[PDB]
């Protein structure tokens, strides 16, 4: 019912409740350790939340034998190419599964009403949020599931768009094996959606577009000196 390769990819997944608890605790302690004169803004907390999520993404990538077949320089080139896409994809899948129309579900388990964004946020963030919600709706309609989510994460990470990889053959191999397993899986498990494979993949360029608008937004905030720094998030922002 499930391709053997997908079962192996599934072993790389973190335990969701442990990650939720860890990031929630981290953000609570961060704020508790600050005096009333140096409290983080909601924006600063959200940035640290994204930074912790990135740490968890790196831990996920490191647990894959495919990724470990790459020298550290190739590993860095892949992560630098897709970090924002993986953050966006993670966020979108979280909404598909746990989201309630009307609000946003965060990795901490908190929910945020969309009308708060609508009333409080500027045009860029609102446009980002609504585009994201459009993808969520499409994916929910396609019955996007965990096995397909893990395939998509691998397709995004092991990207053929990255030039100057030493071990390009390994990336080609992952693309071949993961596309094949995803195709077998969607046919076997969702026979009634006869174009599911093709329609899932059409979300990838959409994710890439949203991720580029998100990097632009975050970069602008960074120029304004607003993103907490000396962390993984700023490091990726500064990647070449």
């Amino acid at each position: 019912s499930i391709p053997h390769l997908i079962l192996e990819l599934l072993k790389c997944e973190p335990d969701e409740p442990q990650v939720q608890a860890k990031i929630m605790a981290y953000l609570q302690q961060e704020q508790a350790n600050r005096s009333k004169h140096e409290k983080l803004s909601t924006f600063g907390l959200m940035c640290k939340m994204a930074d912790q999520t990135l740490f968890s993404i790196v831990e996920w990538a490191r647990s894959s034998i495919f990724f470990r077949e790459l020298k550290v320089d190739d590993q860095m080139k892949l992560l630098q190419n897709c970090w924002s896409e993986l953050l966006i994809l993670d966020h979108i899948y979280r909404q598909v599964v746990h989201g309630k129309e009307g609000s946003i579900f965060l990795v901490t388990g908190q929910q945020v009403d969309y009308s708060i964004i609508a009333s409080q946020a500027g045009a860029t963030l609102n446009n980002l949020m609504s585009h994201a919600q459009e993808l969520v709706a499409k994916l929910r309609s396609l019955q996007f599931d965990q096995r397909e989510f893990v395939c998509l994460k691998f397709l995004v990470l092991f990207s053929l768009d990255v030039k100057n990889l030493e071990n390009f053959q390994l990336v080609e191999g992952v693309q071949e094996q993961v596309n094949a397993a995803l195709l077998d899986y969607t046919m076997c498990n969702y026979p009634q959606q006869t174009e599911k494979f093709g329609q899932l993949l059409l979300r990838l360029p959409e994710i890439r577009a949203i991720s580029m608008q998100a990097e632009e937004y975050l970069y602008y905030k960074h120029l304004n000196g607003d993103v907490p720094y000396n962390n993984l998030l700023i490091e990726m922002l500064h990647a070449k």
Binding site: F55, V58, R62, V72, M76, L232, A239
Partner: peptide, 10 residues
């Protein structure tokens, strides 16, 4: 990138 390198090299 120091932080990422440190993470991957651990």
């Amino acid at each position: 990138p120091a932080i990422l390198y440190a993470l991957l090299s651990s």
